[PDB]
Symmetry: D2
Subunit: 410 residues, 4 copies
């Protein structure tokens, strides 16, 4: 509400409570210390959204035993449709030299077979590397998202063409810190989050985020600040590498990542952010992009508890996320793959609707809107009497999102 950024800082208060919604997603690496169906259930309850499998080490048989476990734990909560949370799987290729080695070709092939939701591609140096990965996945894996790991000086120098070729970006700070002067990594990180924010592409901040929590149940002051600063810069997700894989306190690390992220999302200077994104937004005759910027403006003005968006490809939810609302974006979808991929975008809380398609199309749209009202009350994002923004289209199918209603919570 402050007019300067300096006044905004000065007004920050450690007594003012945060909101119940977390906006930043959480990717955890699954290793030895978290592979168990019991430990996984606890991390899904602690707010893990994305289970990452590292194909540096292990056979295909070890990894397929990890994928079974992740899915078993996930489907354990499937009985209550209101409380179910979809969990994505991510494959992280070893990488290199050629863009795709012989090992990677078999791994990527195994990924399509095991039905992963995304691929983190290692050692991306140019757009033609991303085209090589996309070809190997084929037509069977055409709906798999490719996140390019930036890891060297040439990858940084040619960032713009890689971002145009990708589905999103991973600032992989470990390797980036080996191949450039460690004092410069913070600059590369901010440049890349800036540019991904402007394109509307998801950026993941990774590596040595909670490093001291491998051995001790509490982070250092630096680690608390680091996670919070990635969140304030505009990272879409944050990653836990060794902390979840090999350390002694997997759940504590996930719980610490949850707490920091809510707190830092309450320190964002949204008025300057929403403004700056708009003065950069191209005017077009696209209804969907107009409905979305309308919805974000409305939500500020009435301080809505949520933006509800009905989505098949997730595209309509991605566009709202682009404008960085303060309310959580509840995306309702019948497509299980769409619901898992949604975790990459800041703000989107996906909910998977299981109810069958009613004969009357307007009855079917009402069912899904109420479903999303139930989830929001259950999870405590809003209470009966609050105001929500619902976003829908004028006919069935993708690409027709045109309507925006301001409704009282039933």
């Amino acid at each position: 509400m402050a007019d300067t950024f300096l006044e905004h800082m000065c007004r920050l208060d450690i007594d003012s409570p945060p909101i119940t919604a977390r906006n930043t997603g959480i990717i955890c690496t699954i290793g030895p210390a978290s592979r168990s169906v019991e430990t996984l259930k606890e991390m899904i309850k602690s707010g893990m959204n994305v289970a990452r499998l590292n194909f540096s080490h292990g056979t295909h048989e070890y990894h397929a035993e990890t994928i079974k476990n992740v899915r078993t734990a996930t489907e354990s909560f499937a009985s209550d449709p209101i409380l179910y949370r979809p969990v994505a799987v991510a494959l992280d290729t070893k990488g290199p030299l050629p863009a795709v080695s012989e090992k990677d070709i078999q791994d990527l092939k195994f990924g399509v077979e095991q039905d992963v939701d995304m691929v983190f591609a290692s050692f991306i140096r140019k757009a033609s590397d991303v085209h090589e990965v996309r070809k190997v996945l084929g037509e069977k894996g055409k709906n798999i998202k490719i996140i390019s790991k930036i890891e060297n000086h040439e990858g940084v120098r040619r960032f713009d063409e890689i971002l145009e070729a990708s589905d999103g970006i991973m600032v992989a700070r470990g390797d980036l810190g080996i191949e450039i002067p460690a004092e410069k990594v913070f600059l590369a990180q901010k440049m890349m989050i800036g540019r991904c924010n402007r394109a509307g592409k998801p950026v993941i901040c990774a590596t040595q985020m909670l490093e001291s929590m491998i051995k001790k149940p509490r982070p250092t002051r630096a680690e608390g600040s680091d996670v919070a600063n990635a969140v304030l810069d505009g990272a879409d997700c944050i990653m836990l590498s060794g902390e979840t894989a090999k350390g002694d306190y997997p759940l504590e690390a996930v719980r610490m990542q949850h707490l920091i992220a809510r707190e830092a999302e309450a320190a964002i200077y949204h008025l300057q952010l929403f403004e700056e994104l708009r003065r950069l937004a191209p005017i077009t005759s696209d209804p969907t992009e107009a409905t979305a910027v309308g919805a974000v403006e409305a939500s500020f003005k009435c301080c809505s508890g949520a933006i509800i968006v009905l989505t098949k490809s997730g595209r309509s939810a991605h566009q709202v996320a682009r404008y960085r609302p303060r309310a959580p974006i509840i995306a309702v979808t019948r497509n299980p793959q769409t619901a898992r991929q949604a975790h990459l975008y800041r703000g989107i809380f996906p909910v998977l609707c299981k109810d069958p398609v009613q004969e009357a199309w307007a009855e079917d749209v009402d069912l899904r809107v109420n479903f999303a009202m139930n989830v929001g009350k259950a999870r405590g994002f809003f209470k009966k009497g609050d105001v929500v923004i619902v976003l829908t289209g004028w006919r069935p199918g993708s690409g027709f999102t045109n309507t925006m209603r301001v409704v009282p919570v039933p």
Copy 2:
């Protein structure tokens, strides 16, 4: 589209054509040289919205002969519902001393009987003067709008309480220029338009706007600049006093006021304006105020040709007007008094729907939306294939406006 106001000026081009819609309303005084049913038809075609009757001079019988003429000319175009334009009548009291003299009490009483749409109240010095006028009008005239003429130093000094008590304001520069130093009038004018803009109340700029056009068919360079500068400041309507009443060129004066106003509406620096109005807009749980700010933001982003708003009391249209969109605001209403009062607010092009109320309420809402698509094509504000913003409510009656759809022109 420029980032500074200085760059915005520098980019202005005399070769770039204006839009077909005029946003600033036109009030003309009816005198001897414009009282005729033939001259009136020509001024309605030239874009007169409000016919003002000056109760300084003339009997009640002379004035009732003016009102008959205004209405006859108006109803002559009533055969084509698409082309009909509603025309308001305004009563301008003589005024004073007491707030309401004996003459004014009879005049205001005559106004209620003759069914005027608004009253310009002379010599308003304090809020309790506006309360006196409101009492005299009674309950029979409770829906008549009271516009307070500011005309002296005490009226200026106590502006804020008068604006809170009024339905809108008239900067009456003639008398204001007699009672304060003429070099200060420009300051008082800007202060008052600033403050009325911020409250969302209509302000009228009046007196000696096209003074040289009483005798000559062309204005001076100063007069062209004056009308344009009132428009750029944010006046809702402009007034022609002697030029339409007594001069030789009534139609030329109306036609000159039309041309200047379109041109100056294309020089507004809308990005700074819309921004500044929002940072001053109180957050509330009012759906209507959220739907409206959503609609204005959407309309910028898709450069829509029009905002269509369905309105009974006109209230929903007043709220969109508050945010100063660049598109014309087509307000569709079945209430003839609402359609005439709408001329006071910047941007609102009212259209009066005559078609009977269909049994199905959604069919009835569709009828009025198509009606407003027909008027916009006919008048040339948009063509089939263009994008419009339609604004409607979720149930019948006032105060329920909640929906905003981005639609292709049928």
Copy 3:
């Protein structure tokens, strides 16, 4: 002091008194009704800075009789060095076809002989017209300023190259209003003042400013607004054509132009202006441009009564004027031609020092600074105890202005 432009308007007050300094210069046309040595004395006291001679009509002998009169009236006040005001002469060519007709060649030649301070060149259509005028003036008139009158659509279309070729610009609204649609003139005027402000070139706003004051001792409301709006746009000088030449009230017109201009200079939104000029100012290693922007920033922060600048070519004073300070700019110079040309730039109050050059150069700089303190007290711009910004160089000669001192008034 307000953060928005809307808040700035709303805060304007007709009871808050203006400052004693006028910032906008005044050019008056000398005709039959103002040619007399007695009437001229009265206009110099009323605040005429520039006497313009129209070479449309009259012989060389009639005009040389005007120049004698202007100079006699001027030199009458020369006895008191503190109160003396320098008065420029301007020649306005008839113009056309070729850039310079045969008549113009003789007139321009007569101008160099009679030692005019500037030339208003009529019907400038392209940069090569300004080069033709510059060649005719020769080397004897190389220090004469050429102000290009814009008067047609091609002159407007090619504005940028003319401004690069000129010493300043005159928006000649009369002819510009004949050759383009009168409703567009206000746009051309603002474009040109925008662009001259950004280049740091003087722009004059001319023609039909106080047109009703030819016959009546009081302006219309439109005329009061027009002069004020040119001042608010950023015109450097304003012009009186027929009002001073042929009308009944020459002194009243000059006195009205004085009053309006002080009042409108107190409504400028200086914080946005100074900001926007800086973000457009190229960084360079030029000391003079750094000393000047330093001085304008200092003057805001201490609300100084004046910027004193010692100047030979006037160049140092032109650079301060570029940043549009709120304090008057007292330019002290020993060069009589520099002191007359200074009237073209907004803010500069020139003072001509007559005292002989002291042997010690620092004693000579102190003499001129005290001289400028005396003039400021005498004219009432500041009183003993107030804070002023003094601007000087490190060695004698042009181009060395480097020092900026904040001093108490002695």
Copy 4:
């Protein structure tokens, strides 16, 4: 140079080299692993400005042996006046209950005797605690700076009155993280740096900044980001606790703190910063505050290599520092205590002039200005031909700084 903060981020480049000047000061704790006269020399060369002694542990005799060592190492470089760097000593009280325990009274008394430059006061909960410390120091220690360590929830809640009572602030994150939820520490840190920036008071960011560098010669990615983020927030100094006291790599830690800080000072968005500080700066008739804001504006416009400021109490240098210039601020002083205290303020590079006071006061001012030109060339902040801003007063003694000259480097 970018117009948004988002564009500014996007333009950041890891190939663009930083400037030679560091702006953020470095405080190192002296413990067992850095107490030696040989190790100290190496840390002074690596860019240690402030040697902090922790009075938690050790006798008075152990500490007085540390103070001797620090001063011996410092005075070893005193032979070359151009290369000498002044080094401050800081006493950090154990603290508590009463504001000052019995131990603290003896320690503070020992501090005055040993002639320390500042005191870090532990467990400050209210303004009256700072008054207690100030009384104990007496009149013998009246020129010692009191930095209040904030360390609990009541210290945070009553921040404003403590800041008004203090000479500066230390965000002590270790203890602050024990007494409030660790996820909130980042918020408290930013609030406090915001508020100290606005008051113009030095803020120190402390504790677990390079924690992994106790055992390993390289920081984690989080630690690189943490130091950089404190610098970007607007911390004046950064602190190394255990890393310099007990760890294996004292010099590597100091060298890493140097590198990160130059790099992060090249990512500041100075245009928004300088703007926001000015719109918050009170207008006053104080010459010094006007000369200072003038100097910072000039330095941006000519991209000066340095601001040279001649200072006795350091006050004139503190005021320039307040506006956060991009150039280093070379403060020239004959007062050794002033030169050591200057390390607390962001940007000030103090230089201690040893040359005797010349008879002619202007010759004496020229001597010190040239001295500061020599140091800047020697250290590589600028080269002959570059432009510098020199700041001086009109007479001898404190409080008279009024002049600002833009000069070529001799």
